[PDB]
Amino acid sequence: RQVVNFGPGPAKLPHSVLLEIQKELLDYKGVGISVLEMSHRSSDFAKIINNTENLVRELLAVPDNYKVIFLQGGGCGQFSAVPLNLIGLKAGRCADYVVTGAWSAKAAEEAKKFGTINIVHPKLGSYTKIPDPSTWNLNPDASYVYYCANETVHGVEFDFIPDVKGAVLVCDMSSNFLSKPVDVSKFGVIFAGAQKNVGSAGVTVVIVRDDLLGFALRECPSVLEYKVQAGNSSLYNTPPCFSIYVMGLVLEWIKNNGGAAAMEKLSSIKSQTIYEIIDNSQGFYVCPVEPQNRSKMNIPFRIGNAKGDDALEKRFLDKALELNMLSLKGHRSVGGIRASLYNAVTIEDVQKLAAFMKKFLEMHQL
Amino acid sequence: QVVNFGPGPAKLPHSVLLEIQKELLDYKGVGISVLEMSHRSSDFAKIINNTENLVRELLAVPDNYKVIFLQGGGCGQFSAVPLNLIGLKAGRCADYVVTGAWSAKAAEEAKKFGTINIVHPKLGSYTKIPDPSTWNLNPDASYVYYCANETVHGVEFDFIPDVKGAVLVCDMSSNFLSKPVDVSKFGVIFAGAQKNVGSAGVTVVIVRDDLLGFALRECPSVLEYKVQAGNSSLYNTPPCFSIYVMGLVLEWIKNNGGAAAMEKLSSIKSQTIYEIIDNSQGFYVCPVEPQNRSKMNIPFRIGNAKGDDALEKRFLDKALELNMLSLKGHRSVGGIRASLYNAVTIEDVQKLAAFMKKFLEMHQL
Amino acid sequence: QVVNFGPGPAKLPHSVLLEIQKELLDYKGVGISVLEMSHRSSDFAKIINNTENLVRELLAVPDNYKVIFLQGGGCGQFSAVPLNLIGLKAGRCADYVVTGAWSAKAAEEAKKFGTINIVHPKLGSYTKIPDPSTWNLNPDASYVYYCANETVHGVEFDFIPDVKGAVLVCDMSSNFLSKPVDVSKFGVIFAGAQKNVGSAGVTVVIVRDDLLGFALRECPSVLEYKVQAGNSSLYNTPPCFSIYVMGLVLEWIKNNGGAAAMEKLSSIKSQTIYEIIDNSQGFYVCPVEPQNRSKMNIPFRIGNAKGDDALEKRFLDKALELNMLSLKGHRSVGGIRASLYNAVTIEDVQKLAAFMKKFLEMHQL
Amino acid sequence: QVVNFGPGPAKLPHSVLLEIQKELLDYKGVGISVLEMSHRSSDFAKIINNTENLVRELLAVPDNYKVIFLQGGGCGQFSAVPLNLIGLKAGRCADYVVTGAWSAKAAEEAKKFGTINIVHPKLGSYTKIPDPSTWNLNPDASYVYYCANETVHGVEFDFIPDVKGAVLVCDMSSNFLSKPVDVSKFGVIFAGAQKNVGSAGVTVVIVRDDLLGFALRECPSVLEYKVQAGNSSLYNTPPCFSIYVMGLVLEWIKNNGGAAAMEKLSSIKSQTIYEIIDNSQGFYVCPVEPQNRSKMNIPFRIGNAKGDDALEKRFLDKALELNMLSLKGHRSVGGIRASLYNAVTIEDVQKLAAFMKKFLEMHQL
Amino acid sequence: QVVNFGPGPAKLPHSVLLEIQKELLDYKGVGISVLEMSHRSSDFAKIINNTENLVRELLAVPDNYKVIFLQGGGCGQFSAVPLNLIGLKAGRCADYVVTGAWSAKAAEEAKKFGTINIVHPKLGSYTKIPDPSTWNLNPDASYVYYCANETVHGVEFDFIPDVKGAVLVCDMSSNFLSKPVDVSKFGVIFAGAQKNVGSAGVTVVIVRDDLLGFALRECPSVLEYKVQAGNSSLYNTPPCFSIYVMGLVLEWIKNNGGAAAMEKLSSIKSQTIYEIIDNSQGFYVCPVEPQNRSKMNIPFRIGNAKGDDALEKRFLDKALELNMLSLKGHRSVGGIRASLYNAVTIEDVQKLAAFMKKFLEMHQL
Ligand SMILES: Cc1ncc(COP(=O)(O)O)c(/C=N/[C@@H](COP(=O)(O)O)C(=O)O)c1O
Ligand SMILES: Cc1ncc(COP(=O)(O)O)c(/C=N/[C@@H](COP(=O)(O)O)C(=O)O)c1O
């Protein structure tokens, strides 16, 4: 029985990628050492981190006026780095935030340590929709505007780029990075933790417009300052060498599988398969997210009713584990069930979940 | 062949790399990779808790000391230790002992968060440790910071300095677990894993549990000691594979005799090279005073104290021809540098010893 | 490393070729090969019944439809369809729609068994589908025949044509189970397995149960639907191994999302190649109208519409160096033809996409 | 341990299955399966040519005969033989020699294309070949048909009959290449390959090259001898894998001594069983007159001429317990039947003979 | 791959054996082997003088001591020590400390040359060192003898016992040059080279120069200290090759850090094994008391203190299967004995440590 890994982050990696890492784990391409032993200042690793940046630029069509850097600290680290580097862009130290789920809320709260944060929309009773941009109250003197493209815990995803009336746009794409093409010119800063969609945990990719450097605060750590790191080509200090090497192998895998354009159509096929089972389930599976904001990456749902049948949800997760389908348990803050369908999750995998969901419904529906 | 004298990231034990390779696709039968593993799983809980217990056992860490695993490397703590501690006393003052390039870098970084005073008079050359008595200590300084092993200049403390009861913060990146350490006398110990205990990506921090909460407002949450300690280093996704790698290297250190056996091997390896430099009749020149000579990093010059560039080039070329990697000195000092961390075996240093002996035998006048 | 763009026989899933190899000497532990298995044994009964069940499941074939497995390939049904159905009405007439080479061959073969009226005027170039509303249908015709996907000219139906209540017959040889089909609207569907759902030697035929018993006297017993449906495809020895191979391919299609997912995967594959042609600025020429372009077979020319023989040879030569087999166009059209059947993965097509993009960038004037 | 006495499909040489298994993913280094191989490729031309040459070599087929490989099995030829040859003379009549189940099936099928006349009186039991002197031959008949070996009743011709110079069509399916054959005496020879030369899916048809061009109008083009001979059996996609398998079995026959050695081996094998029957003192009864006994299929009963069902079941149940498969007689006859085709080794017949001897020793009253 | 745990002769450094091999036919260009070198040549004089200088340098032998190389092994000094020194006092009495089989064998041999008195009561088992204050010393005895490291029983002295001024003779064959030695406090130190400093054939004796000339009349000239020291160990033909071999081992010990490094390596190696024995839950049983445990020879039992014969046999069988040689204990004690001399590297000990850990995990209940 082969394992089906629906991991939410860290998540599943392509099997062929794990085969290459295992192959050259003790003698990387004849150099004689491992990537785990490789000096970050050698020519050998210089090609690895340069090829990784070249892949990020190619796959996302990143314009030449954007800097691509690899930092540590994960996504939650960028929750501090974005205000540290950008909240001083305008004297008021004001920043606008769009809270559509748990991770955009966690980021807005963290930004209050560095400036006056304002949520541009009236609070949502439940993270089940994106507030209409026509209802946003945007500060014209705000340094930037922040929003989260894909909410991992709640399954709410933007399928558009919001109009911030010309403001500096900041976006958190950790749970949908390189699942679809992006017009990078519309953004000021894009960041994404690699552990979810483009590699393994340890490294965070950040795409910064080159004219936004140099507004960092005095309290910004040098290792998180965009100007410092973009000047040293992500090599101000020792970067997560192995995680940048793993990321390049996952990026090379996306390119060989059709790039961002193909990942979007595949993400449609996978998410549709599950969403159709839910909508036709006659209430047996309950996804409260509204259809136009449903995420193609994370599909959280309940069983039985809108509040969730705990016994039925316990049998579901237990029968799914004996079938070697891991990490289907929803986030501990919402409970229920969460199916994550990142790039590495194959169509045959979603089919296994889809068949199990149809067989489980035929067996417990009333 | 291949003998890796890397400064950091450095060589890993060949036994460790073999196990990482064996279970990269199916970690101990669970069915997934550690690269694929979730930090909120019970499987990674065993990994990160086993790594913590090894840090506590091998270093004899008291139970009133938190052990957290952060990101950002060494230079991350250059910003993390002031953000977490410079506000311990209202002055926002800190005493810094600059014995080399890494203590100077941390001293410069701390200037972003308060008043930073360098304790001694500025040295002309990082070749000696300013005697602890000539230290201009501030009684109201929030903490005193020094670097146990200066990787670029080869100046290592073989003692714990006296700071008149101040909380002591030490940077042991390039000598972590190379010798037993009295953790009780320290307030905060940090070390980047890539030099002597793991691979690049994760940093060990040992903090006395009564120094949390003095964090400035601008301290990022992933680097705030109080936050990460209260979440067992799981406030956000930690460098899972790096923590798993370190757990195996710590396991290797334990099986070979712990911190007690590492120190004895550190002396054998370091003295083997130092005997060659001292008996070299001026062919090899190491400027460090013998009492402060590092046992991990040995920088020296060839030909003269200023360095014979043409001679040092044939050295590094012939050394590369013999598959001895990363012997080139740091770019700010030049010359040669031999890094003899835990994974570097006695067999390795003997190869470097026989090579330096013959090279001197063929180029000295 | 080989990328198989074969047009029929075509590529099989690597998963399927592996299980066929493992079980070649001892199928499921019964002691013998499938090649040695008797068509009367209880073991082959499970094989052919499962292969019948999968066809009914993956296409949603209603209960009033028979599913049989014949020999003779697709061209066998060019004679078996008239022999079985041209006598539905006493006139011995049949309406045929000639959109390419394979419907043209079927129309000429049917003239041996009756009077055949082609429903539309000659096209001059197989580049479009004549409008079904302009179709000259005979209300006394026994059936209406049409080829859903023309493997040589790349002309595919993206709809079911209205034949005004006439018994409808379709040649789905080259797009069988590449998309869902409303079987209720058809009278007879047939498809050679060697193009999309297995290996050569067997032909699947789907017949409405009231269309049996209209076969002419001259129809062979092994090709009479009524005879073969009455014996469950076992009137004589069936292609046992070829039916077994089909069952594994169908089981592979079911495990990958059924026909619904094949249609969307075929959209990704064909859109990737067709866009390279449209943006080629005349370097790649596909004369088929976009509304009728095939998602399975993409024939095109290089250089200009009539074809540059020099560029088309280097394309096929460099494609052969890269192990991209069977990309040469059919003998009657020449040029290039890429076949993107079910087993052809997205990763395969990307190798073709990168090669066509690089060839254009290197020879475009 | 399994001993396969299958009637058809039958056992294949273990060395053939071993080679098919190892080349199944990468046939002779070309990079693809034969199941994926195009029938128009250089590789398959070499396969189908080698299969034809071995047929011509082992049977010594004269140059004025076409060797074509068809689909539809032997029952397919039951229609292809009349469709191609019943119009040879204007009367459209054919004379048929019914010696068992497969002659009667073929004679009845032929009645769908012309007037068929059995040349001999209806035999009360298929136990003897009517003396060729008794044959009532029509001098205006288009051909004379007879079955060489009746697989169900065990009646075999050990001579080429005299048909007064008429064109002779023979159904050698169950004794093809079990002995040399004077091909020059025949007009059409056909044989399903699943009994003694390969796997199910392909039929070998040897036609004298002047009998081409007499096919009826209703003959399917895939079954027309003239069409297929002009296309080297490549008018449409042929059963590629079956022909590849058939070639390997032909190579195995050639390496084991050709048709001459098969006749010597088939004599030793059938004698081993008949000797048990002839000396069984009525315990085993074989109704066929010994001068017409088949050397390939040995049907018999246990107990008495009509057969004791209680004893025959215990025989088959114990035989199945010993892993001896397909010993049950045909459904229309019941009882026991042993098929001893070329792949059935001498040790296989030795296991059966030792079992029959012990079974006779345990139940003979 | 072979790991040599021999008790004596033991393993030699792989580098030393390589040099012996390379220059076996042409010792440093001279044109002859060492095996052919005349002991009276200028070439061999350089060799034996080199070996003597290395012994003085590594052990810090004061100038008032003679260093001589003799034949006869260690047992040769069991006779040579009484013959040379028992006449130092007219009583012909000598004190012998019996801690194991080698001091016991040395005490018996000493009775041939005088009245020998064992200083303590016979132990029930050679598991500890009798307390030095419990020693019954003869003030009129010529000398006091003891064995520093008992190879058979694993009892080792970690001190220089106070003999109240008497001249002290010590048997250091099992730990010679495994640690710094205060040579001044002894009268005669001897050690067979075949255990920790070379190959069999030669024995080193360190004699204080004021103790020469007390040899009895029956002392052979080749074994008299005054004779050999008077001819620089060249009274007769000395074991030329065994001295040359020994000189390379000494050169190897010097390049690896002298005796101070051999002391640290012995601590790491012995403790790695002892930690497994103390934590074995009685699975491994070392009978020696912790304060007298040898660091060169570790004897233990498996299963219980008396030893499970079947369990220890499967231990030695899998040890041989893993190419770990000479682990079987001495015949008088049985069980397992692991020898950890200077040439036995840490990797060798780690190999054994992992094997002992896995042998326990698969046999312990
Ligand atoms: C003592 C000490 N402190 C901090 C660091 C850096 O850790 P990082 O901040 O994780 O890179 C290091 C790493 N030493 C390395 C740094 O080299 P680099 O200049 O970064 O290429 C070396 O000596 O070559 C260190 O030795
Ligand atoms: C749509 C459609 N219908 C019928 C056939 C005939 O298959 P067969 O009769 O089994 O060969 C085919 C076979 N097509 C193949 C035929 O190749 P061929 O021209 O036979 O070498 C092709 O397109 O190249 C088909 O594509």
Numbering used by the authors:
A (entry chain E): 5 to 370
B (entry chain F), C (entry chain D), D (entry chain C), E (entry chain G): 6 to 370
What does the paper say about this structure?
Phosphoserine aminotransferase (PSAT) catalyzes the intermediate step, the pyridoxal 5′‐phosphate‐dependent transamination of 3‐phosphohydroxypyruvate and L‐glutamate to O‐phosphoserine (OPS) and α‐ketoglutarate. Human PSAT (EC 2.6.1.52) is a pyridoxal 5′‐phosphate (PLP)‐dependent enzyme whose coding gene is located on the long arm of chromosome 9. The 3D X‐ray crystal structure of PSAT was solved in the substrate‐free as well as in the OPS‐bound forms. Each monomer exhibits the well‐conserved α/β fold of fold‐type I PLP‐enzymes with two distinct domains.
The crystal structure of PSAT in the OPS‐bound form was obtained by briefly soaking native crystals in 50 mM OPS. The best crystal diffracted to 2.78 Å resolution, preserving the same cell parameters and space group with eight chains per asymmetric unit. Due to the very short soaking time, we could capture subsequent steps of the OPS reaction, observing differences between the catalytic sites of the eight chains. Notably, in chains A, B, and C the OPS moiety occupies the substrate binding site with no covalent binding to the cofactor, which is in the PMP form in chain A and in the PLP form in chains B and C. Usually, substrate inhibition in transaminases involves substrate binding to the incorrect catalytic intermediate. In chains D and F, the OPS‐PLP external aldimine is present, while in chain E the geminal diamine formed by Lys200, PLP, and OPS could be modeled. In all these chains, the phosphate group of OPS replaces the sulfate anion modeled in the substrate‐free structure. In the other two chains (G and H) not enough density was present to model OPS. On the contrary, we could well fit the sulfate anion, which indeed occupies the phosphate binding site of the substrate, near the internal aldimine adduct in both chains. In the OPS‐soaked structure, in all the sites where OPS is found, the sulfate atom is replaced by the phosphate group of OPS that forms salt‐bridges with His44*, Arg45*, His335, and with Arg336. Another anchoring point for the substrate is given by Arg342, which makes salt bridges to the OPS carboxylate.
